[PDB]
Structure formats: structure tokens, C-alpha cells
Amino acid sequence: AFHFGPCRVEGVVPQELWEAFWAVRDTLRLLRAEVLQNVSDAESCYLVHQLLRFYLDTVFKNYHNKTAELRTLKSFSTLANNFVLIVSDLQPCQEQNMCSSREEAHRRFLQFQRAFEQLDVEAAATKALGEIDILLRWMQKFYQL
Ligand code: NI
């Protein structure tokens, strides 16, 4: 399962995320891999939750081309569904006050958001979708057998 600090996420595994991403990518830095690499185990619950919420609330919404044809919409939907299933475990860990969010952690999310907001939002959304490989390579560090 995934172990994002104290939060165990059981509904989704990396193989599912990767196969969903490659389908999305096939239809198509804000995230600094070096920054994500040094995020503590403890901080991971907050930061994964914040980033996946941002994808679900801002990125997919602002990516116009997801409705170009039904197969494309289905591919995007599969990927978003995987993110929702992860957040459905992380949200309760936050609302039971399980996940730390030190000032440093909020500032790492703000670094991402500042970069995203430099661009026109449709271009930003397109770029952020392309960077899901960065996100998933980081997230899978928290996946154990
Ligand atoms: Ni906090």
C-alpha cells in the first residue's frame, strides 16, 4: 500500500496510475523533482493531498481538450478517478488531524502554485498534465509491497 506519513492509502497502486497516465499522455518545470525528493515521510500526506486536490479542482477543469472525443474523455476520467480514490483516503487523515503541515510544507506547495499561475491557465493545465510523470515517480517512493 501507499504510506504517506501516517496515512495508508489502499484503493490504488502505482501500476494503475502509470497505465492511466500513459493513455492521457498519448493524447497530449512546475513540479521540481529535486524539491519533491527531499520531502519527509511526515510531510508527504499533506503535500500529496494538496497537489492531487489542485489537479482535480484546477488542472483537469482548465484542460479544454479532454472533451475532444469520448475515448479521450474516458482516458482523462480514468486518471482523475485514480486521484480521487487516493484523496478519499488522504482527506480523512487530514480531518482526523493525522497529517503535519509545517510552514515549509505549505511554502513548497505555494512554489508550485506560483509557477502554475505564471502561465495562461489552459497552457498551465496542459503543462501540469504532462508533468504527471514527475508526480507519480515521487508518489511511488511511498508505495510498499
Ligand atoms: Ni499547516
Swiss-Prot record:
Inducing stimuli: Upon influenza virus infection.
Entry GO MF terms: cytokine activity
Localisation: Secreted
Glycosylation site positions: N38, N65
Official protein name in the record: Interleukin-24
Family: Belongs to the IL-10 family.
Shown stretch of the complete protein: 54 to 206 of 206
Disulphide bonds in the chain: C7-C45
The record's account of how the chain is modified after translation: Glycosylated.
Organism for this UniProt entry: Homo sapiens (Human)
